[PDB]
Amino acid sequence: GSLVCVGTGLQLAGQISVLSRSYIEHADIVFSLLPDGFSQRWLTKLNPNVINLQQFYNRRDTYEQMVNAILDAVRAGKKTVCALYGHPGVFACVSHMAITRAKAEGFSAKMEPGISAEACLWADLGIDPGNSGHQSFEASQFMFFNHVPDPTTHLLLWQIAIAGEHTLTQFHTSSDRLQILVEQLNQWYPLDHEVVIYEAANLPIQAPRIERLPLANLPQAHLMPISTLLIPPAKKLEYNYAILAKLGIGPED
Amino acid sequence: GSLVCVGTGLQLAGQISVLSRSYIEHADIVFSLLPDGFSQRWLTKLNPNVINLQQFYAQKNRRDTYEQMVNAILDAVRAGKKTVCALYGHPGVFACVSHMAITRAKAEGFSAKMEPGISAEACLWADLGIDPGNSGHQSFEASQFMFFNHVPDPTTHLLLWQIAIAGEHTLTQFHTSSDRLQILVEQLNQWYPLDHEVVIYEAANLPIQAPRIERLPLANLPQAHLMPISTLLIPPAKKLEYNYAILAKLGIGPEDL
Amino acid sequence: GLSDFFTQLGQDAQLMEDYKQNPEAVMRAHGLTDEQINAVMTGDMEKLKTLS
Amino acid sequence: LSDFFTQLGQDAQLMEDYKQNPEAVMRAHGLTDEQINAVMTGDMEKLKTLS
Numbered sequence: 153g154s155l156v157c158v159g160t161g162l163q164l165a166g167q168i169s170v171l172s173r174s175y176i177e178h179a180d181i182v183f184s185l186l187p188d189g190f191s192q193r194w195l196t197k198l199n200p201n202v203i204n205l206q207q208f209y210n211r212r213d214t215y216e217q218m219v220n221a222i223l224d225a226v227r228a229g230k231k232t233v234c235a236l237y238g239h240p241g242v243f244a245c246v247s248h249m250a251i252t253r254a255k256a257e258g259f260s261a262k263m264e265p266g267i268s269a270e271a272c273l274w275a276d277l278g279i280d281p282g283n284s285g286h287q288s289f290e291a292s293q294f295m296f297f298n299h300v301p302d303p304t305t306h307l308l309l310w311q312i313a314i315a316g317e318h319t320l321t322q323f324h325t326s327s328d329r330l331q332i333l334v335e336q337l338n339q340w341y342p343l344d345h346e347v348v349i350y351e352a353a354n355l356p357i358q359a360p361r362i363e364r365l366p367l368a369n370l371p372q373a374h375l376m377p378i379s380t381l382l383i384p385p386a387k388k389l390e391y392n393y394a395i396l397a398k399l400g401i402g403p404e405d
Numbered sequence: 406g407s408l409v410c411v412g413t414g415l416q417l418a419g420q421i422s423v424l425s426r427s428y429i430e431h432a433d434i435v436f437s438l439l440p441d442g443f444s445q446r447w448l449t450k451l452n453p454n455v456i457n458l459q460q461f462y463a464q465k466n467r468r469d470t471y472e473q474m475v476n477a478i479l480d481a482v483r484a485g486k487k488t489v490c491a492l493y494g495h496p497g498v499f500a501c502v503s504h505m506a507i508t509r510a511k512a513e514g515f516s517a518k519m520e521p522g523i524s525a526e527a528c529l530w531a532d533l534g535i536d537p538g539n540s541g542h543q544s545f546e547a548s549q550f551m552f553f554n555h556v557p558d559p560t561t562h563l564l565l566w567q568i569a570i571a572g573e574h575t576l577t578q579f580h581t582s583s584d585r586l587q588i589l590v591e592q593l594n595q596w597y598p599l600d601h602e603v604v605i606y607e608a609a610n611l612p613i614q615a616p617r618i619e620r621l622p623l624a625n626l627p628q629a630h631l632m633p634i635s636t637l638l639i640p641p642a643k644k645l646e647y648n649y650a651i652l653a654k655l656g657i658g659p660e661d662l
Numbered sequence: 663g664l665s666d667f668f669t670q671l672g673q674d675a676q677l678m679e680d681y682k683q684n685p686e687a688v689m690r691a692h693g694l695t696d697e698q699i700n701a702v703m704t705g706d707m708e709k710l711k712t713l714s
Numbered sequence: 715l716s717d718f719f720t721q722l723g724q725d726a727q728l729m730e731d732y733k734q735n736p737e738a739v740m741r742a743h744g745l746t747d748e749q750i751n752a753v754m755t756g757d758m759e760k761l762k763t764l765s
């Protein structure tokens with residue numbers, strides 16, 4: 153038995169890598185976790201021996217049961233392939249968990265790169281992340297842990313629609329949690345700073361969501377599970393005089 | 406009359422998307438900026454009408470070279486040819502020609518779009534088995550990190566790209582690569598111990614070749630041999646700590662999370 | 663039917679192009695219902711899921 | 715051989731086979747013994763000479 157985790161990208165059918173599609177096709181069994189039924193129907197036609205994981209939705213326990221199932225296939229000696237949407241190692245811990253555990257039981261396990269939502273974002277918004285620089289955080293992690301963004305460079309907050317999700321202690325709405333996220337961000341970004349709600353298209357006849365609004369309006373925004381928030385720079389670049397100096401560049405340029 | 410820029414990913418043949426290959430296949434003409442000869446041969450076997458843009462390189466200012474590239478691409482679009490540009494990795498990441506051609510195409514009123522592809526960063530996550538979401542992720546161009554003020558969050562995975570030309574400028578060339586890298590070390594030393602383990606990464610081009618994953622202490626960075634593609638991965642030096650303030654606002658605690 | 667079209671449209675660049683030229687025609691030529699065509703035109707993903 | 719490399723990179727079955735038994739696969743795909751040698755030594759510059 154072996155394990156190979158692949159990604160299908162965001163777009164239906166067309167955004168998977170040639171090699172990754174080959175892995176699915178030659179697989180003895182496939183564990184899927186895709187967006188819509190169209191995606192699911194496409195997969196089935198690639199390999200009729202599919203097990204949909206979407207049948208397990210606490211997240212921890214859910215994932216633990218997804219992993220365990222995948223491993224059962226590997227243990228049984230099957231050439232197992234797990235197919236995830238986008239990139240199987242980008243904000244997706246089900247793949248990493250399965251790979252980690254497989255290795256522990258002494259099985260071959262690896263991950264093939266795929267096209268992530270972030271990859272789609274750059275293209276759709278005509279941004280070159282290479283020259284611009286970029287940052288990414290899980291919205292909830294950004295709230296619950298001490299992260300410091302660099303307000304000179306693009307900032308992406310993933311899973312913005314579940315921002316501030318936790319074991320229920322007191323009554324709080326999504327808007328409430330987002331409001332807190334806004335106040336937190338307000339340390340670096342003015343309330344009137346334009347941000348962008350982005351959602352890559354999943355279907356070829358569908359256009360992406362590229363909605364711009366002031367940060368202050370985020371709590372009132374209609375967000376989807378697939379929503380990613382882009383926060384463009386709000387701080388102007390400044391010379392690293394100290395380092396420039398050592399390189400041989402003084403303030404006299 | 407249309408323009409579509411596609412990426413081939415990093416690996417030969419395998420890492421291009423299904424649609425992107427379809428684009429190359431049904432194109433009237435294809436302009437390429439590919440790494441090696443195996444890539445070029447693969448491409449031509451896919452669509453025999455190819456112009457290698459690498460002919461506009463010094464066989465001159467890169468701007469001039471790039472202009473000739475964009476002009477060559479647009480010439481075909483203006484001619485009414487269904488034109489496809491085949492670039493390495495993601496056609497939008499570290500890809501001036503691609504962006505220029507698309508912008509200049511849209512300006513002349515032609516249809517033009519960029520199809521996302523697998524980037525070096527994408528290969529990095531997979532090869533090292535690291536999730537950028539785990540503890541977050543920041544990516545900067547090394548020279549920009551040295552020239553301008555960018556304070557990193559040492560809880561994240563930090564990536565410095567084009568480390569090979571770090572701090573390179575006409576006025577800094579009296580320095581050696583080793584010298585400039587030594588200066589970068591001291592800079593990073595603000596946040597990262599001299600013994601902190603860092604990784605030099607390079608994705609593989611050929612399927613019989615493996616990615617470069619060299620682990621070394623930060624202090625040894627200056628002695629390393631670096632390629633144009635080389636990237637520096639700097640893992641977290643500090644572990645996440647709770648925002649007890651925000652937690653209190655939601656009345657939750659570390660346990661609830 | 664809708665699924666098969668979407669699937670092919672997503673992976674076939676020639677079909678993608680042909681579609682852009684005459685969407686409705688292409689969709690009609692692929693045996694899509696007028697409402698489906700409408701759903702696509704009105705971007706009624708919901709109605710498309712429903713039709714599916 | 716470009717053909718072998720092209721196939722190896724796009725065919726998952728070939729990839730899996732190659733990884734476990736590279737020499738045999740390469741031979742079955744009509745590679746020379748020196749080509750196989752070059753690959754197993756990672757001598758890319760040599761493979762270029764034979765490209």
Ligand SMILES: Nc1ncnc2c1ncn2[C@@H]1O[C@H](CSCC[C@H](N)C(=O)O)[C@@H](O)[C@H]1O
Pocket residue numbers: 162237238239240241242243244267268269270309310311312313350351352353354377378379380381
């Ligand atoms: N169509 C889409 N457009 C934009 N962001 C998306 C998206 N689908 C998923 N995401 C992002 O991904 C998160 C789910 S986690 C899955 C991510 C996937 N591995 C990838 O490579 O993208 C969402 O909360 C959102 O932040």
Ligand SMILES: [Zn+2]
Pocket residue numbers: 270286287288526537542544
């Ligand atoms: Zn990133």
